[PDB]
Amino acid sequence: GAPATVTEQGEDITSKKDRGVLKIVKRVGNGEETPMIGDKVYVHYKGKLSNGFDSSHDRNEPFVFSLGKGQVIKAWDIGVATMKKGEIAHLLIKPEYAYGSAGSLPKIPSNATLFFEIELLDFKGE
Numbered sequence: 001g002a003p004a005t006v007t008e009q010g011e012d013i014t015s016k017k018d019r020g021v022l023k024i025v026k027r028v029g030n031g032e033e034t035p036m037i038g039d040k041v042y043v044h045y046k047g048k049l050s051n052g053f054d055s056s057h058d059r060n061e062p063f064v065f066s067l068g069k070g071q072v073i074k075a076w077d078i079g080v081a082t083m084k085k086g087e088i089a090h091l092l093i094k095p096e097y098a099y100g101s102a103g104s105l106p107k108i109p110s111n112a113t114l115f116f117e118i119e120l121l122d123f124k125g126e
């Protein structure tokens, strides 16, 4: 299903072209602007380890963060920078762009691949 489809069909949006962060657009958003570094960004998301969720909907409010400020994993700083307002995307993320061989116990083991569906709700310049 979704993680496999991203492996098969996703665009590599890494600078290194190392397939560290693969993307599919699932719903098209509106506008020419994508967020840039410093913007306050509002999303809903559903994430899991790629082998089978943490969801913003669990907490009945959007997840907010400042883009490219190291507040989230590298793969979000990269991925969300490509998204338009109202876009839903699927990301599949190797450990290098997430929590690495160190991991982040107890939630994240060593060398974990992660999957997210992200909806970009809004963003505003600092």
Ligand SMILES: COc1cc2cc(c1OC)O[C@@H](C)CCn1cc(nn1)C[C@H](C)COC(=O)[C@@H]1CCCCN1C(=O)[C@H]2C1CCCCC1
Binding pocket: 045, 047, 048, 049, 053, 054, 063, 071, 072, 073, 076, 104, 107, 108, 114
């Ligand atoms: C490693 O720790 C966690 C990882 C993830 C979520 C974590 C978390 O405990 C801090 O908490 C949520 C349960 C509560 C909301 N939340 C998200 C963040 N801060 N508070 C942002 C986190 C500090 C870092 O998270 C991330 O960079 C990414 C992208 C942004 C959304 C959350 N992210 C995660 O990696 C989740 C993780 C997804 C896979 C399934 C396990 C949880």
